[PDB]
Amino acid sequence: WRSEATFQFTVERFVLSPPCFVRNLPWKIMVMPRVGFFLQCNAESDSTSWSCHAQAVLKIIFSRRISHLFFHKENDWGFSNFMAWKVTFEVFVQADAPHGV
Numbered sequence: 001w002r003s004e005a006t007f008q009f010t011v012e013r014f015v016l017s018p019p020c021f022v023r024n025l026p027w028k029i030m031v032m033p034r035v036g037f038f039l040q041c042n043a044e045s046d047s048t049s050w051s052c053h054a055q056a057v058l059k060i061i062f063s064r065r066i067s068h069l070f071f072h073k074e075n076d077w078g079f080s081n082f083m084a085w086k087v088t089f090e091v092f093v094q095a096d097a098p099h100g101v
Contacts, residue, residue, distance in 0.1 A: 008061065008090035016040070023052055023095045030076060035085045038078025039093065041070040047101070048072045054095035061088045 001024055009017030009029040019026035028040040039056050055067040058078055068077040 003096070004092070004094040006090065006092045008088050010086055010088045012086045014087045017089075020091075020093075022093050023054075023098050024101070025050075025052055025095075025098060027091070027093055029089050029091055030078070031089060033085055034080060035082055036078065036080040037064075037082035037089055038076050038080075039066070039091055040076045043075050049100040050098055051100055052095050052098040054093050056091055056093040058082065059090040059092075061090050063090070 002022055005020055005022045007020040011031055015030060015032050017029040019028055025042045030038040030040050037058050039058060041052060042050060051069055051071040053069040057063045057065045064079055064082060066077050
């Protein structure tokens with residue numbers, strides 16, 4: 001239920017990280033070549049009415065911020081070209097109350 005959180009994910013042999021719940025929803029880090037670095041929220045659910053407006057600072061360990069209302073069809077947000085192509089990624093997600101869960 002925490003309103004915000006900072007979590008990081010280390011990619012060895014450098015696509016997702018374990019879930020980090022904030023506002024009761026599972027947030028995850030997504031990394032992939034074309035390097036892309038996105039924040040995922042509630043991708044598991046089969047629900048279509050949930051929405052969570054959050055703003056995050058995606059960082060590799062410099063960082064890039066987003067502000068996005070994640071929902072059904074847009075639950076993954078970030079940068080396909082975060083940086084040019086182990087290594088650690090960090091994400092500070094600050095969200096507000098979800099409205100439809």
